[PDB]
């Protein structure tokens, strides 16, 4: 997914393993719900 | 003086071994890669082992 | 200011490189002779380089 290790640093954010999983769900909804 | 790193020189010699059951005189190598046998009779003179051979005759010189 | 060779600068007796104002050099009279003064720069003292007196032949540390 071409990610950058600056974001696994957790200081003022949430975890990135869990932002990935949430971007993937939207990239799905834009695909099925008439992504054609 | 004159380090080995410039003009390298070997560590192995040419011998002038002399046979046992043949009397013949020859020249051989000290670190052979084969089985040096006599040039008339056929008995071995040196044997190949790793680094330096283990000769089996009488030496006359180191040449 | 009366420049008749007002001074000269000392040089190391092994390499010939003159000595900077504040380094850990040394000088002393030649052992075994007593007639020559011997200089050693900091870098020839640190890696122990041999010297030899310019008058007799006595050598090294």
């Amino acid at each position: 997914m071409k990610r950058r290790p600056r974001k696994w640093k957790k200081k003022g954010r949430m975890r990135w393993k869990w932002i990935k999983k949430r971007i993937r769900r939207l990239k799905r909804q834009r695909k099925k719900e008439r992504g054609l | 003086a004159l380090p080995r790193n410039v003009i390298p020189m070997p560590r192995s010699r040419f011998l002038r071994v002399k046979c046992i059951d043949c009397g013949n005189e020859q020249i051989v190598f000290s670190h052979p890669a084969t089985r040096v046998r006599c040039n008339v009779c056929g008995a071995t003179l040196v044997e190949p082992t790793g680094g330096k051979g283990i000769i089996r005759a009488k030496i006359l010189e180191v040449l | 200011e009366n420049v008749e060779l007002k001074f000269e600068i000392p040089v190391c007796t092994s390499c010939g490189r003159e000595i900077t104002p504040r380094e850990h050099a040394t000088h002393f009279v030649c052992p075994n002779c007593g007639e020559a003064i011997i200089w050693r720069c900091e870098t020839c003292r640190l890696l122990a380089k041999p010297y030899k007196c310019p008058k007799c032949g006595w050598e090294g540390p």
Binding site: - | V6, I7 | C15, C44, L47
Partner: protein, 129 residues
């Protein structure tokens, strides 16, 4: 692999003399290397040198005097016109005649100070000061 036997020599010389050595061995010995030693000698930077043959391209023994600050190779080997020397002398050397700049002119190898007397140019190969 090996690409330049002259650069290796000049870096070896300036690395050795910086720690106090009094002899070096320039192993792969061209005659360009010998020709540049010849002009490093006439200006008083090295002592005496000899060519020793070893069956494979020969070696060079040279004695140092602790009289050089820096030596190196001008690599891309630019060309120079006979009236454009100062532009390069202001780039490599530290004052208006401090040291030599070695030039591969069409009449041999020489320092730029003797090229300006004949008025010729050529390729720059190295510099010593």
């Amino acid at each position: 692999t090996l690409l330049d036997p002259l650069a290796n020599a000049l870096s070896h010389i300036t690395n050795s003399e910086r720690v106090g050595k009094r002899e070096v061995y320039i192993k792969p010995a061209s005659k360009l290397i010998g020709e540049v030693l010849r002009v490093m000698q006439k200006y008083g930077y090295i002592g005496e040198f000899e060519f020793i043959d070893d069956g494979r391209a020969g070696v060079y023994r040279v004695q140092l005097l602790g009289k050089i600050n820096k030596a190196g190779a001008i690599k891309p080997r630019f060309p120079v016109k006979a009236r454009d020397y100062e532009r390069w002398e202001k780039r490599f050397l530290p004052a208006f005649e401090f040291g030599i700049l070695i030039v591969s002119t069409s009449q041999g190898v020489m320092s730029h100070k003797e090229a300006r007397e004949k008025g010729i140019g050529g390729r720059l190969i190295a510099y010593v000061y």
